[PDB]
Structure 1
Amino acid sequence: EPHSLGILHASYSRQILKDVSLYVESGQIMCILGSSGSGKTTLLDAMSGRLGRAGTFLGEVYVNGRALRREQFQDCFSYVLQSDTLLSSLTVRETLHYTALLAIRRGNPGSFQKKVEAVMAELSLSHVADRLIGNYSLGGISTGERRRVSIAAQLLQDPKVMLFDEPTTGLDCMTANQIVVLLVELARRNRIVVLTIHQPRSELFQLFDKIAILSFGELIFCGTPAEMLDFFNDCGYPCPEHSNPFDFYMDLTSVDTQSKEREIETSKRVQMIESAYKKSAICHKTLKNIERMKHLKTLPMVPFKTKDSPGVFSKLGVLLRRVTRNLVRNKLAVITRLLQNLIMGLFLLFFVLRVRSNVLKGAIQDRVGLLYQFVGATPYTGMLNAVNLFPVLRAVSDQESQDGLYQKWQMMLAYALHVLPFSVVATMIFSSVCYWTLGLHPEVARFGYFSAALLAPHLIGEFLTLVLLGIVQNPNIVNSVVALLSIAGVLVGSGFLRNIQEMPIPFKIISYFTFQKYCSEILVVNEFYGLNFTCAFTQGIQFIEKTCPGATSRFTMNFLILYSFIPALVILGIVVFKIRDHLIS
């Protein structure tokens, strides 16, 4: 009931944080104000365990008896980021149901929600619980309210020590305060609360148990507002009325560089102001209190934060249900996955009409182009699918996994897994409609094959695009590159445009490495197995031979290989993402 959270002589590396030291008890609030130079944020992040870097972390943190160990931070803290991205097509209760259902293993998918209720109603958002969360533009969850929910997700973990980054920032007169309140209330509910506040008002100065200043990662004052209003006048420089006590104090606290003159002078000031209460009684006192908690053992005598969030095998199964749910409740999106592939076939169908086969005037040459386009579009549709849908999920995996919920790949797997249904329907929608309208040897079986041959590319695009979207982080580039890829590919890797066998050395090698080849050399054989054109050539095989001779026999396999890529791509993906958790801090 008095909870203990102290720091002694903490530092960080290129040595951005210097021998800082601070005391807090449950029910209090900590207000960190950091100069634009800051350091503040850096620390706050650091403490939540976000990374542990080239360089180092000096000092140790004392939490309710005992010292914290580097390997336990994330266990005994909770973190609320500068922003709060959430999946735009779910309901509050659903996002929370999934965060909770993912974070903990207990009663049932019914009872979970009941826990959720305590959180929603403890945060006073029950009243929107089951609406379209929305982006601010799409759906109209309150731009204030959303912030609120983000907090909810941390409370399912039942922490009693909470860290919030810049959480006023990006709001308005009314809302900011409304949010601040709720922080403080959480403090009322026997919690520890730490803030890094960029540009707050003069009204709020007076709402803080403990306010504390950082300059260039060097610590300065920490204490009661009144205490600052005194001890800073113990250092001199009293802040007049009509100055914003909260803000004025900072102006003095930070050096800056409009010239060498303004620059050097001020750094001396902030040094002297630092030493001033680096020595002072209060700064002794605060320190002693962090020495107190070890020295004493008292009633709280405990730390706390969550237990078991297990079965990885089980874990992502949820992530899937979530993602499919998202992607399904988004009329915008779904329609396209299924449909565009068809659009391709219509759009062609419209120019090409049906396959004139009577004459040779418009016979092989109309089909070559047709297959070509299919093989060099059905991966395009893939990325068109991916690049557009996935980033949200990707970045949400990013901001989520950091708090400690599901490893980066989990998600990528999930996405990759759901597409199957959709893409596979798309392929069928497309095929069923077009293939017969174009009427290129129509025995159902050979349609059946043609629909399996164009499902693969439409996935390959997806999963490649996916993989890349883990490595490259600026989708619109990914969507240029993957195009270039999946077009270049066809040129070299189906016979059509340069009689592969005939082509000069190296490209030949390349071709064998592209799915394109092993798709085309299906489609050609599947659609020419044997046919007869009126007139150069004459028969179905006589063309098969010219472009891709070993296809006829090899068909059985080709499929094997064509579908071979799609496990690989995703498997690789896993690795890229497994890696990528290290890449961005």
Structure 2
Amino acid sequence: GAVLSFHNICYRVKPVEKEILSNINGIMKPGLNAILGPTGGGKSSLLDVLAARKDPSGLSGDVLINGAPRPANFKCNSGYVVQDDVVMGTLTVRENLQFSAALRLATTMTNHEKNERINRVIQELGLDKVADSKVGTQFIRGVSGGERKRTSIGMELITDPSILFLDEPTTGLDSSTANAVLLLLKRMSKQGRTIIFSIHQPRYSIFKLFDSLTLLASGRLMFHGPAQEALGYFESAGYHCEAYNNPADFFLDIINGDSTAKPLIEKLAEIYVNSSFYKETKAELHQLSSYTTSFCHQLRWVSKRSFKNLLGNPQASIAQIIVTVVLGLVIGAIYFGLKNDSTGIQNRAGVLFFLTTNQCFSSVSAVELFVVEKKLFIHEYISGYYRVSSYFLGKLLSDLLPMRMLPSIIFTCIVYFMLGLKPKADAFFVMMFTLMMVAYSASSMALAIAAGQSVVSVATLLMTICFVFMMIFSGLLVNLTTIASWLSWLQYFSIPRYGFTALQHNEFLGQNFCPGLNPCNYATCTGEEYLVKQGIDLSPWGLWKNHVALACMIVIFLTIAYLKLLFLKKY
């Protein structure tokens, strides 16, 4: 079995540094161990310290498994269940468990075997009725909080861990369900596994199951030792129960100073260090003194989950495609029959500008989903599911690449022929390629800004402002040849400028807009004159210059996003 231990633990958090956890010493031998305490005592913090999910800076003690230091496979042979559930709402119960099994259990096992394990877990936790139902989504009403909580427990159990950490496994659950969960852990603990969990308001039947007990309060350790002997320890100092049927209440009332015999917290702790229990553990403590699956598998499974999540959030995929089609048709109707007249220049420039800005501003919606999933990404990376690289490339090849390509194609196919733009194939494909490139560049910039930011509103605001400032330098609202020199350099940071310039160069090159024709100066009859007055070049190199600039921006921004994820605080 696994014999966890700790000694002289203290933790500090920040300027001013405060100690959430003061001196703590204990041994969590195999079996079933518990951590009772009042709210704010530090139950969740100690658990993370034991499971190495806290920044090692603050930690000021030694944690040992079976005497030897922490192995590098610790997170490959342990499980952690979070106080606040992190479960992808858009998926069903079974799908989430499948995801955990696939990326944590080794690939040597057959997929049928894994599904058999998954079914067994579901039956044990009583999730059969909602096995294939969806977890809650904003659009889709889903399972209750209790079923969601048990689902998080399931994902960790599937790994068949030798060590399991749980935080408030029984919250939002009625007594019957709570008892079933605890009995399962007890059965799971009579085989050599070590189970550590924090609980609120146990029943007497449950409390008898506890083998080892830990009692936190305001950081201090009031009592650690066998659960059955806890009553005797308190009785010696005073506090003869003889009132409460449930002992768990008897402990908490003492801590809150509601029972008969400087602060009561410090006073009680001083008693423990003088107890035999502290002496025994000090004697024992002093005496004692990688990823399962490869890159490709992680990529496939992450991309799959992203596909499903995207389809489950309609506003970002289905709605964008539908509005794309509607806009294409309306534009085709509004600009139908472009004429080489006085009005041709205006309408052509306007439509191209509209398409460009539409591609740029549509990227905001997708990345917002990248923002909301920061918490899940951190939790899964810490738990040891996947690497950063796999998550990044999967989200790209599932969300950014497929969906952002289509709007360009739809817009070109619908608009080009209805309006009557350049009737040559080269122009058609150039238009499609250019729109694709601006879309990808905007998405990459959005990712660079949004990656690592927790709040959706702030990221949305920042990206919107940046796109606005780009749009001012697109080449239509202002003439770039009239801008002062000390500000003109900014026009090279604008994506819409490159796309818009390319489209203009493609459309205006061989057109005359004065129908019947002593040249009339101050008049732009020919398209080339308009291009010149707007600053654009006439060589073939201008178009391709814009395109290569877009590609370089894509690469730069995506790389920045990867680095922002890499140097993030995953603790």
Q: Same fold (TM over 0.5)?
A: yes
Instruction: Confirm or deny that 1:283 pairs with 2:278.
Output: yes
Q: What is the RMSD computed on CA atoms of the aligned residues?
A: 3.1
Equivalent residues of 1:337, 1:422 under 8 A apart: no
Match of 1:394 in 2: 374
The whole-number CA distance in structure 2 between the counterparts of 1:356 and 1:24 is: 79
- Deviations along 1:142-191, one digit per CA (max 9) or x if unpaired, are 53233223223223332121111222234455544444444334324542
Query: Cα offset for 1:137?
Result: 6.9
Match of 2:87 in 1: 86
The whole-number CA distance in structure 2 between the counterparts of 1:200 and 1:380 is: 53
Letter in 2 for 1:570: L
Comparing 234-243 with 134-143, greater Cα deviation is found at 134-143
Match of 1:564 in 2: 552
Letter in 1 for 2:395: Y
Match of 1:365 in 2: 346
Instruction: Confirm or deny that 1:6 pairs with 2:5.
Output: yes
Comparing 47-56 with 227-236, greater Cα deviation is found at 47-56
Letter in 2 for 1:354: F
Unpaired segments ≥5 residues, structure 1 = 257-265, 296-306
Query: Cα offset for 1:446?
Result: 1.5
The whole-number CA distance in structure 2 between the counterparts of 1:96 and 1:236 is: 49
Match of 1:212 in 2: 214
Matching residue within 513, 520, 542 for 1:533 = 513
The whole-number CA distance in structure 2 between the counterparts of 1:415 and 1:127 is: 32
Query: Cα offset for 1:320?
Result: 1.4
TM-score for the superposition, normalised by structure 1: 0.85
Match of 2:392 in 1: 412
Query: Cα offset for 1:134?
Result: 4.4
- Deviations along 1:321-348, one digit per CA (max 9) or x if unpaired, are 3322432455554312433333444455
Give the SS at the match of 1:454: helix
Equivalent residues of 2:372, 2:454 under 8 A apart: no
Question: Structure 1 residues 341 and 201, CA, compared in 2 at 3 Å: closer, same or farther?
Answer: farther
Instruction: Confirm or deny that 1:550 pairs with 2:537.
Output: yes
Matching residue within 16, 23, 26 for 1:22 = 26
The whole-number CA distance in structure 2 between the counterparts of 1:391 and 1:497 is: 32
User: 1:121-140, aligned counterparts within 5 Å?
Assistant: 121=123, 123-125=125-127, 128-135=130-137, 138=140, 140=142
- Deviations along 1:231-281, one digit per CA (max 9) or x if unpaired, are 11111123453586423422432689xxxxxxxxx9443323222222212
Query: Cα offset for 1:520?
Result: 1.3
Equivalent residues of 1:92, 1:149 under 8 A apart: yes
Query: Cα offset for 1:439?
Result: 2.7
Query: Cα offset for 1:124?
Result: 4.8
Instruction: Confirm or deny that 1:163 pairs with 2:145.
Output: no
Equivalent residues of 1:49, 1:70 under 8 A apart: no
Match of 1:321 in 2: 304
Equivalent residues of 2:7, 2:63 under 8 A apart: yes
The whole-number CA distance in structure 1 between the counterparts of 2:197 and 2:441 is: 46
- Deviations along 1:186-233, one digit per CA (max 9) or x if unpaired, are 324542221223565677544433332122322111234442222111
The whole-number CA distance in structure 1 between the counterparts of 2:389 and 2:253 is: 45
Instruction: Confirm or deny that 1:506 pairs with 2:486.
Output: yes
The whole-number CA distance in structure 2 between the counterparts of 1:41 and 1:33 is: 11
Match of 1:342 in 2: 325
Equivalent residues of 1:532, 1:540 under 8 A apart: yes
Instruction: Confirm or deny that 1:445 pairs with 2:426.
Output: yes
Instruction: Confirm or deny that 1:470 pairs with 2:451.
Output: yes
Letter in 2 for 1:572: I
Question: Structure 1 residues 239 and 527, CA, compared in 2 at 3 Å: closer, same or farther?
Answer: farther
Query: Cα offset for 1:510?
Result: 0.9
Instruction: Confirm or deny that 1:74 pairs with 2:75.
Output: yes
- Deviations along 1:354-391, one digit per CA (max 9) or x if unpaired, are 3642531x32122222222222221111112321x333
Equivalent residues of 1:386, 1:462 under 8 A apart: yes
Give the SS at the match of 1:541: helix
The whole-number CA distance in structure 2 between the counterparts of 1:521 and 1:137 is: 41
Instruction: Confirm or deny that 1:47 pairs with 2:57.
Output: no
The whole-number CA distance in structure 2 between the counterparts of 1:101 and 1:501 is: 58
Instruction: Confirm or deny that 1:38 pairs with 2:38.
Output: no
Query: Cα offset for 1:128?
Result: 4.3
Matching residue within 457, 472, 495 for 2:438 = 457
The whole-number CA distance in structure 1 between the counterparts of 2:384 and 2:465 is: 37
The whole-number CA distance in structure 2 between the counterparts of 1:132 and 1:212 is: 37
Task: Report how many aligned residue pairs link the two structures.
Answer: 554
Match of 2:196 in 1: 194
The whole-number CA distance in structure 1 between the counterparts of 2:309 and 2:275 is: 56
